[PDB]
Amino acid sequence: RTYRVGDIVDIKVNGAVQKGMPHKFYHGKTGVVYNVTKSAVGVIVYKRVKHRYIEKRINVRIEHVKPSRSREDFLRRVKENAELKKKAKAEGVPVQLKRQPAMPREAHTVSIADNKPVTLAPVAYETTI
């Protein structure tokens, strides 16, 4: 797999080399590629200092770089938003196009006919013996 200038990549230093490696801040970070070399790549990372952002450039080898899926969900949601909007226009019915956060659970009833509860002590009596 080759990398090109402009895409978004993750930096994960693989292997057991993380013993005396100097700079562990950029492990697990995500950035934009600005320079490509055969076995190295240039990554633009941002760091927060108090109230501002400071840009940094790092040179990371290829085996510690994987492509990112940051925009995958956005491009997907755009695709099915267009598709279900066209389907809703074809069928003449409304449909939800916005994500909603998780709602509280509603009222329901749980039967104990075949699911009689088990009484638990703070420690197990099998462990006491």
Binding site: T37, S39, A40, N59
Partner: protein, 46 residues
Amino acid sequence: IEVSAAKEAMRPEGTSVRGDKRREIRARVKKNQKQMLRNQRIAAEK
């Protein structure tokens, strides 16, 4: 390796930061044999 923005701007295309130390080493080694060959030639003249 972190790199300076000015250093990357002044860096020629194709060259990387992973060869700067080898470049400096080759420069020092070349100067060393230049001095050594001058000394050898002067000793040969003597």
